[PDB]
Amino acid sequence: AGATLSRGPAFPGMGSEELRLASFYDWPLTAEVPPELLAAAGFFHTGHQDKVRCFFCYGGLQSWKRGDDPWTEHAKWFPSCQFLLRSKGRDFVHSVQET
Ligand SMILES: [Zn+2]
């Protein structure tokens, strides 16, 4: 037995990092994490505050602060994300989940 994780991105259009970066044109001044790191780690900006979603697993995160690693938060909250696993690797995700 065992269902399989689907391969289709939640938002295929936001699969381009370049386009993900564009969405952070209004990423707030009181925000504390750089758009480039966020966009690199699969996230694009939604709304007018500091909410982001991953283009693939659609994991939603907000309340970002100075020192938050987008790749680490990605692995903390959405470990089965296929974009995350292909980018950072099995060992990286396992490491964040254990600790
Ligand atoms: Zn994801």
Swiss-Prot record:
Autoubiquitinated and undergoes proteasome-mediated degradation. It is found in: Nucleus; Cytoplasm; Golgi apparatus. Transmembrane segments: none annotated. Isoform 1 and isoform 2 are expressed at very low levels or not detectable in most adult tissues. Detected in adult heart, placenta, lung, lymph node, spleen and ovary, and in several carcinoma cell lines. Isoform 2 is detected in fetal kidney, heart and spleen, and at lower levels in adult brain, skeletal muscle and peripheral blood leukocytes. Signal peptide: none annotated. It comes from the Eukaryota. Disulfide bonds: none annotated. Zn(2+) binds at residues 54, 57, 74, 81. BIR repeats lie at residues 20-85. Binds to CASP9. Interaction with DIABLO/SMAC via the BIR domain disrupts binding to CASP9 and apoptotic suppressor activity. Interacts with TAB1. In vitro, interacts with CASP3 and CASP7 via its BIR domain. Belongs to the IAP family. The RING domain is essential for autoubiquitination. Apoptotic regulator capable of exerting proapoptotic and anti-apoptotic activities and plays crucial roles in apoptosis, cell proliferation, and cell cycle control. Its anti-apoptotic activity is mediated through the inhibition of CASP3, CASP7 and CASP9, as well as by its E3 ubiquitin-protein ligase activity. As it is a weak caspase inhibitor, its anti-apoptotic activity is thought to be due to its ability to ubiquitinate DIABLO/SMAC targeting it for degradation thereby promoting cell survival. This is Baculoviral IAP repeat-containing protein 7. It comes from Homo sapiens. The gene is BIRC7. The chain holds residues 71 to 169 of 298 of the full protein.
